[PDB]
Design a binder for this molecule. Sequence first.
Ligand code: GDP
Length: 173
Amino acid sequence: ETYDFLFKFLVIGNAGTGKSCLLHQFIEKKFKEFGSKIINVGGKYVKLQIWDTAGQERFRSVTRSYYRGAAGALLVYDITSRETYNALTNWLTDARMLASQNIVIILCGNKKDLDADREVTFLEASRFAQENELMFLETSALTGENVEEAFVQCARKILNKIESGELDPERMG
Ligand SMILES: Nc1nc2c(ncn2[C@@H]2O[C@H](COP(=O)(O)OP(=O)(O)O)[C@@H](O)[C@H]2O)c(=O)[nH]1
C-alpha cells in the first residue's frame, strides 16, 4: 500500500534461457509477458513493473519504446548454453543504448540446477560481471534459487544510486 517507488524492469537475453519461467517463479513461486510485485527493500516498499521479453527477442521487444524508462534489467543467460553467455555483450549494449547508459543491470546465470550440463563456470561469469560493472547471481527458475534475490539486489542498487545522486528517480532511471 505505502509503496514509495515504482521501477520499470526489463528481463532480457536470448530465447530459451528461462526469462518467462524466472518471472513466473518470482511472482507465483512456481515454475510453469508482464508482471508486477511490491517488495520491501530496507524499509521502503518498491513496486516493480516487469517487462519480460520472452518470445519477443528476435526483434519485437528490442526497441527504444520497449526499453525506454527502465531503471533496472535482469540480463539472463543459460549456464548450459555457451552461446547465450557469449551474447551478453550484445544485450548489454542494447540495454545501454535503448534504455540509458546508467541502467542498473544484474547478470543472471540461469538453470544452475543443470550442473551436469554446465558450459559456463560461475568463476568466469563472476569475473566478467566484475569487469562490466554488473551484479551477478546464478539462478534457477526451476527451484527458485536466487530468483527473488535477483530482483531485490537490482532494486537495492537502484535505491543506492538514487541515494548517491547518480540516478534521477523522476528521470528514465
Ligand atoms: N532445469 C531448468 N530448466 C529451466 C529453467 N528455466 C527455464 N527452464 C527451461 O528452459 C526452457 C526455456 O524457458 P523459458 O522460460 O520459456 O525461456 P524464454 O524463451 O527465455 O522465456 C524451457 O524448457 C524451460 O522449462 C531452470 O532454471 N532450470
